[PDB]
Design an enzyme around this catalytic site. Structure first.
Site, PDB file in Angstrom:
ATOM      1  N   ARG A  30       0.830  -1.209   0.000  1.00  0.00           N
ATOM      2  CA  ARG A  30       0.000   0.000   0.000  1.00  0.00           C
ATOM      3  C   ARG A  30       0.866   1.262   0.000  1.00  0.00           C
ATOM      4  NH1 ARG A  30      -2.008  -3.521   3.560  1.00  0.00           N
ATOM      5  NH2 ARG A  30      -1.663  -2.188   5.406  1.00  0.00           N
ATOM      6  N   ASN A  36      -6.537  -1.824   2.056  1.00  0.00           N
ATOM      7  CA  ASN A  36      -6.719  -3.266   2.210  1.00  0.00           C
ATOM      8  C   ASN A  36      -8.222  -3.569   2.191  1.00  0.00           C
ATOM      9  OD1 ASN A  36      -5.661  -5.972   2.836  1.00  0.00           O
ATOM     10  ND2 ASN A  36      -6.874  -5.755   4.681  1.00  0.00           N
TER      11      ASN A  36
END
Length: 91
Positions: A18, A36
């Site tokens: 990320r 997520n």
């Protein structure tokens, strides 16, 4: 200008992915989020120049060098975010 939402699967957690995506959006000053999914996938959503966006798919589909994407899905959108930054999200 365009917008998309992307869903990604593989070893794409416990590898900093990320943050990889965050910096790969920032290096094109794209706007949107990465998050997520509790399901076990990861999600990207972005807006910007369509060439920069395609280049950002090329970044995302690699994973980080530490990651491995094993499947990826894309939906273009035309219902703009109108955002001015990229973000890391968990909502």
């Amino acid at each position: 200008m365009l917008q998309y939402r992307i869903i990604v699967d593989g070893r794409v957690q416990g590898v900093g992915f990320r943050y990889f995506v965050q910096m790969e959006a920032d290096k094109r000053k794209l706007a949107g989020w990465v998050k997520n999914r509790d399901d076990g996938r990861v999600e990207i959503l972005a807006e910007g120049p369509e060439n920069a966006l395609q280049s950002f798919v090329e970044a995302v589909k690699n994973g980080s060098p530490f990651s491995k994407v094993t499947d990826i899905s894309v939906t273009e959108s035309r219902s703009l975010e109108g955002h001015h930054r990229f973000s890391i999200v968990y909502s």
